[PDB]
Curated annotation (Swiss-Prot), chain B:
Compartment(s) where it occurs, according to its Swiss-Prot or TrEMBL record: Cytoplasm; Nucleus
NR LBD domain location: 1-233
Motif nuclear export sequence (NES2) boundaries: 206-215
First and last residue of the signal peptide: none
Intervals of motif nuclear export sequence (NES1): 81-90
Tissue localization of expression: Expressed in a number of cell lines of T-cell, B-cell and fibroblast origin. Strong expression in brain tissue.
Clinical note on disease: Intellectual developmental disorder with language impairment and early-onset DOPA-responsive dystonia-parkinsonism: An autosomal dominant disorder characterized by global developmental delay affecting motor, cognitive, and speech domains apparent in early childhood or infancy. Most patients also show movement abnormalities, often hypotonia with later development of dopa-responsive dystonia or parkinsonism. About half of patients develop various types of seizures.
Task of the protein: Transcriptional regulator which is important for the differentiation and maintenance of meso-diencephalic dopaminergic (mdDA) neurons during development. It is crucial for expression of a set of genes such as SLC6A3, SLC18A2, TH and DRD2 which are essential for development of mdDA neurons.
Protein's name according to its UniProt entry: Nuclear receptor subfamily 4 group A member 2
Disulfide bonds: none
Summary of subunit composition and partner proteins: Interacts with SFPQ, NCOR2, SIN3A and HADC1. The interaction with NCOR2 increases in the absence of PITX3. Interacts with PER2.
Recorded family membership: Belongs to the nuclear hormone receptor family. NR4 subfamily.
Amino acid sequence: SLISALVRAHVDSNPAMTSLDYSRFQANDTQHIQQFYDLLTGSMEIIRGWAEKIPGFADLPKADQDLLFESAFLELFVLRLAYRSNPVEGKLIFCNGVVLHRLQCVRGFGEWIDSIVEFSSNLQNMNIDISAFSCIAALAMVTERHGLKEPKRVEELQNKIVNCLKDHVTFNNGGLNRPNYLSKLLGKLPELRTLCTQGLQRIFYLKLEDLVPPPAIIDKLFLDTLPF
Amino acid sequence: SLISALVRAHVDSNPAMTSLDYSRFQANPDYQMSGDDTQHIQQFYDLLTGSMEIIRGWAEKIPGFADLPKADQDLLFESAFLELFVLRLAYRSNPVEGKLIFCNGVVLHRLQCVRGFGEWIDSIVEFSSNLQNMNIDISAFSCIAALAMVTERHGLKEPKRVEELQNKIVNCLKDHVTFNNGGLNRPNYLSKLLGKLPELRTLCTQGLQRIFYLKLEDLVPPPAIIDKLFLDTLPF
Amino acid sequence: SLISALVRAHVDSNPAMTSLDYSRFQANPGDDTQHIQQFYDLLTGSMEIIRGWAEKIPGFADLPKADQDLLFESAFLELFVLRLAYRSNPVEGKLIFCNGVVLHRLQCVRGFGEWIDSIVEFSSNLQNMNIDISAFSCIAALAMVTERHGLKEPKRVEELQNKIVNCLKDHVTFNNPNYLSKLLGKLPELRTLCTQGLQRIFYLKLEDLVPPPAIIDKLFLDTLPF
Amino acid sequence: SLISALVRAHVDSNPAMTSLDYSRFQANDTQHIQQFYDLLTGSMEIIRGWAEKIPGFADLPKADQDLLFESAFLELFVLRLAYRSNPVEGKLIFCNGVVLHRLQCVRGFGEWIDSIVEFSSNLQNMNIDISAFSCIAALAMVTERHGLKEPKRVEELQNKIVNCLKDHVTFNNPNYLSKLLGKLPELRTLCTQGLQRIFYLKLEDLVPPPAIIDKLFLDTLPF
Amino acid sequence: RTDSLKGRRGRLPSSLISALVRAHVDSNPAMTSLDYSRFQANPDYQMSGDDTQHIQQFYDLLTGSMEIIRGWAEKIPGFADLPKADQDLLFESAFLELFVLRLAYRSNPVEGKLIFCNGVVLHRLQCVRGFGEWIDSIVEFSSNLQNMNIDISAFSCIAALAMVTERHGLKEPKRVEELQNKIVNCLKDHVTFNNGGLNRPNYLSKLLGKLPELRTLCTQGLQRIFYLKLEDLVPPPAIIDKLFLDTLPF
Amino acid sequence: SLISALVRAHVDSNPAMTSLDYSRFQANPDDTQHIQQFYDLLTGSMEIIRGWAEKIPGFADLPKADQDLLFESAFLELFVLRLAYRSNPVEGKLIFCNGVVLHRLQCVRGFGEWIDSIVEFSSNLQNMNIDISAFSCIAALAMVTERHGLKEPKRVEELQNKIVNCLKDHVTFNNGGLNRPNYLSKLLGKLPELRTLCTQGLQRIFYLKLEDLVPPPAIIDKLFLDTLPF
Ligand SMILES: [Br-]
Ligand SMILES: [Br-]
Ligand SMILES: [Br-]
Ligand SMILES: [Br-]
Ligand SMILES: [Br-]
Ligand SMILES: [Br-]
Ligand SMILES: [Br-]
Ligand SMILES: [Br-]
Ligand SMILES: [Br-]
Ligand SMILES: [Br-]
Ligand SMILES: [Br-]
Ligand SMILES: [Br-]
Ligand SMILES: [Br-]
Ligand SMILES: [Br-]
Ligand SMILES: [Br-]
Ligand SMILES: [Br-]
Ligand SMILES: [Br-]
Ligand SMILES: [Br-]
Ligand SMILES: [Br-]
Ligand SMILES: [K+]
Ligand SMILES: [K+]
Ligand SMILES: [K+]
Ligand SMILES: [K+]
Ligand SMILES: [K+]
Ligand SMILES: [K+]
Ligand SMILES: [K+]
Ligand SMILES: [K+]
């Protein structure tokens, strides 16, 4: 039930891997930077829709919803990108269907893009099925955050998702041949958070470069993702 | 890649368990023989025709299907429609509570479907009970649904093409199972999973007997679309 | 150097006798389900601790991560029993675990089964040999760094073993005769003791009162000699 | 008709208690363990023949026939042994007519033999007649197992034998039919200890079980 | 063993290979037609110096197997369909590895007996003069290969994979990858089926892992040929010169 | 070593699937002609199969008289076994020891309905998917077995047991062991089935002898009293 709801949410908020845009894809500045910004802001509405489809999420104080969302947006944008992309081939696929190459992105994302592809690769070598990934993505947002009004409520939804993930992995001796798979899975969240600090560094860099000022929406993003 | 498409196909053609319409749901046994069968037999025909566009939409979303000769696509879909309908129904319903949930979100009790479906509805609930006791995950179920249609059919223009698409799906299902077990396959589980198809085929012949019965009774004659359904499903 | 590192590995992976938890200790000469789950917990709770120990053995962390897992997985039960036997108090029937918990023999027999009696016996024999920390730290390392099938680098393994062997050899001489053979002779004795540990888990799986979790089932399969 | 065929199947597959083989008997190593292995392997064809004489068994899918036999063999071997032996005198009498004293079997069977003698004593203290026993033995095998091709066929045949035992009990008439069926679960538990013995012997590695015994092991495992 | 509780790991049991086996049997000396005429295991009877003799022998054993291994390669189903150019590239790129693999498989490491594609049986001590210290590594490899007890059907696939592998400068490398995959899936299905439907990923990783080890082992062969030419005592003839350049990974 | 020698004996005495002779194959419709061919296929395999027999380690160490007796007694069985293993039943393609390829339908006139029994056995055999090493042992076993009139029944029993041992080791370590519990048994079980199968071959030759349409050559007429269960 919950797992099915988590999977539908994922499916409904992701591009059909049979409806991808390769118009500007080529495995061969101010232009690539603004693009970096667009991609980020473009996924904001997509991921927000996804969050609203997480059972129990709409039952949290609206204030707690925006706090959870905003604090995890970047992590969510990167985890989703990492899961649907083809690391080996260096093909990046965004929440909107656009497909760029690891090299075309390096001009906008910076060397961070290389850190992302590496994460994408480690993530895929874990062979995470759609159900386990749908739980993990939800766990990246439904987690403890400073400033929460209903921290106990967040913790309850969190534990419900981990339990849902645990049953999926251990049902009928599903864990026998993958001992700490559940632990390795959860372990990807702190790695993801560490990974996203470089996204903040990049945004800071572009702001100090003052070659192309970040939009208020992203300037805002910088502050919401800021751990402190 | 292939399995994601298959899961997307399934998800997109099924109702979110939040769109579930529990309005026409009646569990009181007494309030059951109320209202002549006509209304119930019609409901039966409608539920079947109602899922046609839906399942055809799912079939069109199956990678490789459209590359098959247009006549084969039609022979495969028409021959498997009823089985798809029954399988999808059996996977999403709640057998323990005697609740049937259709390709459209309508929730009827077993006791209500008996008026239209006939005793066949009990064989269906039993099939649902066996299917759900296996705890098939969505990725696995989406492959099985696909394999109920992408399967051998006599009078197929390019049977070798279908066989290849079929192998591709089977192989996609084996990887899922094997990858979730640390790289070690599970041949018995797999055969138990694939064995549900012959069972589905057998279960549905009873659906053909219910339509034949309705045709003979001639009280609520099957409309042209159900007539076609009957002939497309006839194993001979 | 090697000996020092081996001792540090031991010390850092063991509880100080002044940080023990007696909250669950009861020697008066609970649900059966509770004792069995406790048995499973004491095993799973020691895994990370003992893994930490292994990773502190000079060279181990240099072997292919594949070989590491194979050596660790095949010796864990033995490492658990040996460390428990070395630190416990046979005479007083006090079993002391990797995590500091103290349990009386009588409390363990309901979870561990009669096998706890064989462990207390082994712990008694081990202690009568008055083995010092340096020597015990070498034996412990040898219990794991030993011949195993499936090792991507069998050479890289016998390399460590022998070094550790010589280390214990020089330590016995420098501090001094048929004593070195009595020490290594404890390893085959250890492995036999652990076959009884396998019987206990096999029994619990048959009784099906409380099936072993996946982690314990794998432990079961990994410890099987074949 | 059924009870008769069941009794006949039983008599034809058991040794004439007047022509027992004592050539290896003695009331005073690796050999006893080997003998433990042989007794088991020798009773296989004998019990297989018996199963083959159960009305309706041979009609089940071949796969199911092999599945039920392979899964209940150890229990059938033990049950049949407990029934024909003499617990009071500590004499174990096997399917093949061989007679050994408890003191000989403990060396091969292990302390499991004592549990077998205990079960034998409890069984015989119930004064179960040959007709009733012939039903219970059949129930030890024609029961539900995970993997049946036609689980219904099995349940079909099972109730039929159960009804067969029911009538025989009523005519001769109490909770007896209860204590009767109760022995099966007890027999099931008793044999797990048999699995423990075989497992211990495999670990010990002294005298390795032959391929056929390892097969029996994997075949009986309840998990 | 894959036959126990440990080996099953919680599970329960349920043409191309034949051609590959024939290719192998036809291209190998009957172990009953071996030539022991020059087999001298006596440390003392190591013919009076003359490094030249042994070095030329080294070159001859190599060239003497070329036509044989080329024949075998031509019996690999699907190989011919490949562009002649790729056939040549794959063959020349793998010849050395194929030569050592086959030698390692048929030889007797425990007795120090090296048995060549042509039937000649030489002792390890005789080969060290020609092959150099490299012969000891081959023997080690041989020893490790045989401890796996790989049956003829399995080895025939591995030998084929030593050649049907990606190489830089391929006309149709995709057609190559498809033959390679066909052969690997053939090996997997054969091992799985023969294990009662239960796959053996660890065994399979070990079998295929032997190829990287073989590639590495042969670089030492290149080092020997490089040495012999640097030493210029018995320069490498034109055919060995080509062998060297064909095997160069760069 | 023995098993490896058994495999070479098999490979050397069998036709490469790329060197087959279809100059007579058809697979579709189109007499004293079919019967003569039936006799030729049998006599032609004789030399081939005898060549294989001599390649079996230890077989040449038996008294020549025991060699002839063992060979002669198993000829038909070997002919059928080898035919069933290499042929392709699904497509009804019979491939003989000599490379000649005929369709099932082309054989029914000379072989009789027995050809249908062979194709079935071929079908059952192939479903077992016996690998070459195991098959090479079973073929050897069909011949190295007990027969009445052996001069050295103990020597034969010894070569036989060495072969089954060779087979048991290969099956346990390469054919799944207990993961295929009844394989070794089903495999040896094919020998008695093979023998029964060939009795129909004797009946065929009997029939042809009674019809006297074309008298069997001494070789085969011999094969008759050389295969006869007595
Ligand atoms: Br849902
Ligand atoms: Br894992
Ligand atoms: Br998709
Ligand atoms: Br899934
Ligand atoms: Br699978
Ligand atoms: Br009767
Ligand atoms: Br009697
Ligand atoms: Br086992
Ligand atoms: Br298990
Ligand atoms: Br061939
Ligand atoms: Br050449
Ligand atoms: Br191996
Ligand atoms: Br494996
Ligand atoms: Br594999
Ligand atoms: Br292995
Ligand atoms: Br040979
Ligand atoms: Br083969
Ligand atoms: Br003799
Ligand atoms: Br089998
Ligand atoms: K993993
Ligand atoms: K209805
Ligand atoms: K499989
Ligand atoms: K299963
Ligand atoms: K009676
Ligand atoms: K072989
Ligand atoms: K495999
Ligand atoms: K078979």
